[PDB]
Structure formats: structure tokens, C-alpha cells
Assembly symmetry: D2
């Protein structure tokens, strides 16, 4: 893992029956726990993003996490890895997502699949009324050989309110690595739309692990 | 809708990171609420079915339901239709699925996408320890113009026990139809493996609507 | 168990911080699966019922169930019994309840405790906007020696809509009885307010078990 | 609020049908976010604690939280307050709890009610196989005038594993106070049994609020 890394993404998604794909590129600093990427969403039925990109943001790599130089870094040791995330929204919307991260040189290849259903036709997701995720604290624990991550996330809404989403993630390594103690990952994710429709968008994440 | 109908199916799925596809054909009696179909699962990485087919069975059409000749048949009136189902398993496994049913002559075309994550590596699903679904009672209610279906299903296990799964489904019609009163759909689904691996399998469903 | 039985009830409850008690009397026909009772709610802080009585109705006896004269009647064989119910409302309200039923002659003594929290100050419960429960189908299954009951219930609302509540119940017998096959209990519960405030209210239930 | 405060507690509880009460006393430093208390559990049916005290620990006051001298302290401003907590355990156990905190001089009076059901007869709770809560990060957000707290907590188990519990709390002030920004409360709770049965036990909590 180098001080500076490159990224590439490809996503195959479906939300409320809407087929779509995503392409992206970015640059990040694994040791600093920072990264920035630019994405382009392509609706199968050519058109503007049909839902809040925020449902996708967290899917688009724990290698980009600042870990104390003592604590086992489950991610760094892996370098690939498989990710599986369950998103349970407070209004009945549910999304499942799984992805794989591979490394070629200084390039991280991220390939994912996303599938969301039961999102209210008029909720924050479908109506694109979200602004981004509130800073969160992801609790990392070990469960039967695999690293689990849990977080009661909050999607901020245009207007001021928030929309609750419970995240449950399984982090799987292709091979055995030294397991970490239970810990927490502090995150900051920011979304910046590059176009009105939100088809072109930029994402930045800042993450730091804390010994608890 | 004829007394006798033909069916064809195509599924694009992913479970715990495993890509797969499904093809099937069947015949059914819409008015009688009966149907029988034969499927063939093809694991992307050529091989035996990697998980319990029972997670897929309910995905593979409410037109095959016996409704009293008085009660509005939300399904029959539609004839296409979009389906969205959330499967929440008691052991953390979660699957989302969405499909579309179209009608050509006496042929029902069923195209679906399935995505499951967080299934315990050693649970009933991954270990293929299920036998089939226990007869259920699906509560149908109207919610903001759409027909909803809810059921606390039970997957029977080899050995005797059961594995709980809450089903939440949205039934959407391409156009407006006369809404039903809240009601219940009584179901019986039976799975019959045609080969050891369970790649080739047969399914039969019997469904009857009840005025409550 | 006689063809005609008498009932008496006493409840100690708390909802959103509101202490209250309940007293009731009724008569029922165990073999017919019918029963009618009259209750009187007393708010600790003297006053009108502070929330929908419907949250309490299902707490106020499976002995009042019509079972086929062949099928093991887990309830009848018991005659006492302990009940434990978890109520998970769709709007975040949660209620836990446990009760005991004892039998003296032709009199059923029902003693219960109810505790509800997180009900939206302005939801259907607190605002008393419910009308009653929609007819339901309670799925009965055996789980580790005890009879479990699950139901995705629907509280009907003034105006027309419905409010979802998942019921999860454990039925415990003081001693060993012949276990039933998984089955379903069809219910009809009706509430009739005897006074404006709803402090005095009448309840009637009709239940029939079905071999599935 | 003084630099040093005194506490007294009284709890009325029920778990899996077991009636019990609790009495306690402690001393704490509100500004430092520290506190220590000693409790004595009395089982209605005289005997050793029938379940893990850890289910009760978090019930036994956000005034004991270190807040930056700039950030609105929703708790301190209140000084009484009402608390409502929903505990959803991963194995089906559910507990609801509500309490009130009043202040007399340098004495905090804490009166609570606890009610738990559906805990597996042989799970970590009933079998008293827990050691304590893993350090957590409670996300505090505002929801319709009230402060909400959410946390995906982890009860550590004898042996090494953990048992998951989602905490959902409503914090209500008797009167209007300046609302905080969404934030996080970092906690450390430690339990020390003073007797074999765990009837006599000591608790210590350390809490610090973080501007996010």
C-alpha cells in the first residue's frame, strides 16, 4: 500500500425497479484515511439520477482509514477483500450491496452490485431530498472469524431533519490476517453534485480508527 | 387470462457474493390458483447450487390465485406488473428482490433480479439445510395506492426446526385498477429437487384468497 | 374447562411514562372460541384514557379458541399458563407485556403487566386515532419446547388507513403437554367504547384454529 | 448542578415473568462525566439475581456527561427529566424501560420501571453469561423537539464473544431548553459484582460528549 493510491469503480445497480450503472475514478491516501472520487451515474433509461446518490456513497474501502501504527489493520493486511452491506431504512426501504476490491499496482479496482427495494415513492430517497450522511461512528467487532461493522447512520435531509438507516456490514478477507480488538471507525463523507441532475458527482471520505 | 397459462422465467441473482442465473418453464391455472414449474440454476462459477433454492422459490405471480368471483382481483385486472420483496431472515441474512411479469398470449414472462447478503456461512441457507416453506397466510393491505403483502414466513429445516423470515412485498400495477379490501392469501409451495445438487428443481404453488 | 367460563382481569400498565391500571370481567365459551368482556381503565393521574385501548386489547387467553377435536390443544391441556408478548409498532413505539392465567372453578383469573415506550406523541396510539385490529392469522409454531405465535397485525385507523404492528408471543405451560403441529389461529377482535373517554370499554374475540 | 452530586435509585422490574426491585446509592461528578453507584437487587421470590444485571445497568443520567463549555447541554439545562428506552436484543429478547430523574439539593432521585420479555431461557441474559457492555458511541440527534439517542451496543460475553443490542432512547425535558447539534456521547460502563449471586453490585460510568 502506497502513500498515494488510485481508484476505479464500476457498479451494477437497481433501485425500485430502476436499472443503472456507475463509473468512477479517484485518488486517496490510505495512511491518512482520506480519499476523493468522481462518479458518473448512467440510468438504464437515459435520464437524471432517479434517486439520492447518498444511498450509494458508502458502497463506493477501509484501506482508506487512519489506524494507529500498533493496532492490527484488518484491511491493510488483506492487501483482496469482499464487502457485504445491509441497509435498513426507517421508512421500509431496504438495500443490499456487495462488492469486491482488488489491487493492481497503485490502483484499487472496486466492483459492486447494489439492489434497493420498497423505498417510498415519495420518500427522501426517491424524491432526492437528502444532503448527505451525518458524521458517524462505525463500531467494528469480530464475529466468527470475520470483521463486522455496525452503525446507526443518519441521512441528513434538505430542510433540516434526518432519515435513519441501520448499516450492517461483513468484511471478508481472501486469507487469514491478525484480528483487531473491537474498535470504532470515525467517518466523514461529503457529497458534491457536479451537475443539476446529480449524475456527475464528487465524493470525499475521511476516516480514522480509534482504540477503545 | 386463460384457464391454462404458460410460463417462462429468467433470473439474475447474487447471494453472499455468488453470481448466478436461473431459467424456468411451467404451466398453471390462474383461476384455480395452481401452477407448476421446472427450473435450472446455473452458478456463474459452474457448480452445484451454492445455497438453498427456497430463498428463491417465492420470487418465481399472484395471477395464480383463486379469488372469489366478486372480490376485486388486483392481479387479474392488471393483465403487466412489478413486484418488490424484502426478505428479512432471523439470522441476519437479508435478500431483496424485484421482478416484472409480462403477458404474451398464454405466456407469462417473468424477469427477476435477486440479491442476498449477510447470510451466515454456516446457516440453513448457505448450508442448504432447508426443506421448504411452511404453509403461510399472506396478509394483503392497501398502502398509498399500492397493494402490500406481509407474511411472517417459516422455512422448514432438515431435522425438524424452522427458520424465520419476514416477507414484505409491494405489488405495483402499470395502471389503475379497482383496489381490494384488506384480505389474506393462503399459500402452499412445494419444492422438489430433480438432481442431487438441486440445480434442477421443480416448484408447485397453490394459492387461495380469503375474504376476511 | 366448561362450556361456559367466567373471567376476571387485573392489569398494571405504563405507556409513555403514564401509570395506569385495568380491571375487567367477562364470560366466554372456550370450545366455541368466543368471549366478551367489559373493562375499566383507571389512569393513575385520574383522567380519560391517555392512549388507544387497542394496544391493550390483545393482552386481555388461547383457551378461548375453537380447535378441531383431534389436534393437540396446547392451551386446553394446560388447564395454568404464562404469556409474553413483544409488540413492535411501525412508528417506533414498542410495548412489552407479560401475563398469567389461572383457573378457579369456572373462573379465569388473568393478571398482567404492560409497558410501552417511544410511541410518537402524535401517533395513532397517543392521539387515540385507531378503531381496532384487522382480522388476523396468527402463525403458531414450536420453538425449543414452547409454543410461539407470530403475527403481522394491522391496527385500523380512523379515516381508513392502517398502522402496522408485529406481534411475537411465547406461550408457556407450567407443565408438559402434547405439542401441536405448526398451525394458524384465525382471530376477530372487536372493541366497543362504553364512554366517551374510552375508560369503560367492551371487548369481544372470536378465534378458530386451522390445521395447515 | 454541583461539582459533586449524590444519587439514589429505585427500580420496579419484570423480566421473563420475574418480578423484582432495585435500590441503589452513588456519588458522581456531573462536569467530569463520572459516577459510581452501588445496587442491591431483590428478587420478588427471594433469591439470587435471576438474569444479567447488564440489562439493567444503562437504565441506572446524561447529567453525568462531560460537555464542552460551549455546546448546549440539553441535560444540564433541564436541571427534571423523563427517559424512555427500547432495548432490542439480537436473540429476540426485548426490554422497555422508562425512568424519571428529579433533583433535590445535591441529590439525584432516579425512579424507574423495567420490563423484559422473550429472552431465551438459555441465552446470555437468563444464563447470566455476560461480563459488561463494550465501550460505545451513542449518537444523539434531535427529533421533533426531543433529543434522541441511538446506539448499536454490544454486551460482552463470558468466553469472548458479544451479544448485540440496539438501544433507542427518547430524552424528554419538562420544559424548553436550547437544542444541541447532532452529536455523540462516548461511554464506558463497568460492572463489579459484590456478591456471588450478583444481587449486590457496583457500577461506574464515564461519559464524554463530542462535537462532530
Amino acid at each position: 500500500i502506497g502513500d498515494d493510491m488510485k481508484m476505479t469503480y464500476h457498479m451494477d445497480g437497481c433501485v425500485n425497479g430502476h436499472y443503472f450503472t456507475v463509473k468512477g475514478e479517484g485518488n486517496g491516501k490510505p495512511y491518512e484515511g482520506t480519499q476523493t472520487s468522481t462518479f458518473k451515474v448512467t440510468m438504464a433509461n437515459g435520464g437524471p439520477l432517479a434517486f439520492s446518490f447518498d444511498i450509494l456513497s458508502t458502497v463506493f474501502n477501509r484501506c482508506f482509514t487512519a489506524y494507529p501504527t500498533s493496532m492490527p489493520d484488518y484491511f491493510k493486511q488483506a492487501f483482496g477483500m469482499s464487502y457485504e452491506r445491509t441497509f435498513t431504512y426507517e421508512d421500509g426501504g431496504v438495500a443490499t450491496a456487495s462488492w469486491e476490491i482488488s489491487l493492481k499496482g497503485n490502483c484499487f479496482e472496486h466492483k459492486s452490485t447494489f439492489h434497493g427495494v420498497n423505498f417510498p415513492a415519495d420518500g427522501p430517497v426517491m424524491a432526492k431530498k437528502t444532503t448527505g450522511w451525518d458524521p458517524s461512528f462505525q463500531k467494528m467487532t469480530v464475529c466468527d472469524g470475520i470483521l463486522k461493522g455496525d452503525v446507526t447512520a443518519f441521512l441528513m435531509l434538505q430542510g433540516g431533519g434526518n432519515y435513519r438507516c441501520q448499516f450492517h456490514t461483513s468484511y471478508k478477507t481472501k486469507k487469514p490476517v491478525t484480528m483487531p480488538p473491537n474498535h470504532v471507525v470515525e467517518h466523514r463523507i461529503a457529497r458534491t453534485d457536479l451537475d443539476k441532475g446529480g449524475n456527475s458527482v464528487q465524493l470525499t471520505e475521511h476516516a480514522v480508527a480509534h482504540i477503545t
